[model samples]
Target: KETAAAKFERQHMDSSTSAASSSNYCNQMMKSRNLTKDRCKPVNTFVHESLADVQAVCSQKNVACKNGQTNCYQSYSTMSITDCRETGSSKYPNCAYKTTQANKHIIVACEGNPYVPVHFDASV
Candidate 1:
């Protein structure tokens, strides 16, 4: 089975450019990252940080997930991120998105032994 940790990395990791060019960044990224294969992802966030840095968040301070889960942890330092939101006109197989980049503290949910991020909880 594909673990949540792997899924989280697939959906959120983007240790590439700190900033993206063009208004269609999301349009391109969403598809390239496979978020728009069958349906458009309504909202997603990409963290432009190293895999190690993101994994380390699993050991950070515990916090509450929006769903009231206590397995969430928040990063102590702000990190670069690109938020992608589907456009109103977006449709499956033709997903369109808007991208917004920012630097903020990220929160994620962790699990299992040698705990690691499995879900992106929020950004603040």
Candidate 2:
């Protein structure tokens, strides 16, 4: 019974990592991090930043959500992040992901009390 805050902490709040630190991060993390449930999460982003920093995005610049919603916000800081892309033929129970690390301004959706992130819109 993980809350949104808890889920964010698990799937996104990664900071001890570096571009050359580990290659099996996504491979192991996609499941260990709980993103791979009954079905794989195909693509998910891990922001290598502190929880306070990522939560601060809600008060940053507002943008349109990719799904055409109006609840997105763009981070003003360039953050370290890992993009987990599921490889083709990556079947269930054997999900494989290509992990790529980079720095980018991320976009996310915020909602409810205190206005924390509810969804990861994108990272550009």
Candidate 3:
């Protein structure tokens, strides 16, 4: 079974790349990262920061999660990130995504004794 923390890293971490110039970035990543295997993920984000940098956010100030939990933390600094959004014509068998890049503060949910990020909440 995959831990939520590992799942988050698989879906959102992209430390090596600063920005993607290719329009197919999302389409390629969505499938390569196993996000579109069973169904099309409506939206997903990839943070261009080291895993350590992301994990550090767990110790930041806590905020409200979308599900009403107070375990979410927001990054104190903005980071480079890419958003993968499903296109209007997207279908499950042939998932399509529109890639958009930006720099924003990331929000994620932390859990367990080590308090690492397990879910990506939002960016602003």
Candidate 4:
């Protein structure tokens, strides 16, 4: 089973054409951010199940039938859950739960500034 950080690194690194020529961008980011092995662990929150349930609720709210595109608004595979669990531990435990959307909104409060909600779309 791959760790969440490992999965994250793999996804971003594999998709980048430049990753083949040099050090992976994601790996660099992790290193620069001081994300060590001991720093990554599972979070002890209900957010995963909460988010899953929320997705289900969102689907019902929109009266959308579940499918590959709109299943539960955003469903989780067992692998994702495991990764999420492993990644949410003590060191980096405060990471937020996010939903997939055409335009997704997320609140970032880690920065020293006021809480700001940002919107981002999936990459093509």
State which candidate has the highest lDDT.
Answer: 3
lDDT of 4 at 71: 21
Candidate achieving higher TM-score, 3 or 4? 3
TM-score of 3: 0.96
Model 4, CA-based lDDT: 0.25
- TM-score order, best first, reads 3, 1, 2, 4
On lDDT, the stronger of 1 and 2 is 1
Clash count, candidate 4: 5
lDDT of 1 by residue, 1-124 (tens): 5788899988999888776666888898888888888778899999999999999998887899999989999999999998999888887877889889999999999999879999998999
After the best TM-score superposition of candidate 3, give how far the Cα of residue 94 lies from its true spot, in angstroms. 0.6
Task: Point out the higher-scoring one by TM-score: 1 or 2.
Answer: 1
Please give the CA lDDT of all the candidate structures: 0.89, 0.85, 0.92, 0.25
Query: After superposition, which runs of candidate 3 have C-alpha atoms over 4 Å from their true positions?
Result: none
Which candidate has the top score in TM-score? Answer: 3
- Candidate 4 lowest-lDDT run of ten: 103-112
Better of 1 and 4 by lDDT: 1
What's model 2's TM-score? 0.90
Estimated TM-score for each candidate = 0.94, 0.90, 0.96, 0.21
RMSD of model 2 against the true structure:
1.6
Candidate 4 residue pairs in clash (backbone atoms < 3 Å):
41-89, 42-88, 42-89, 43-88, 43-89
Of candidate 2, the 10-residue stretch with the lowest lDDT total is 12-21
RMSD of each: 1.2, 1.6, 0.9, 14.4
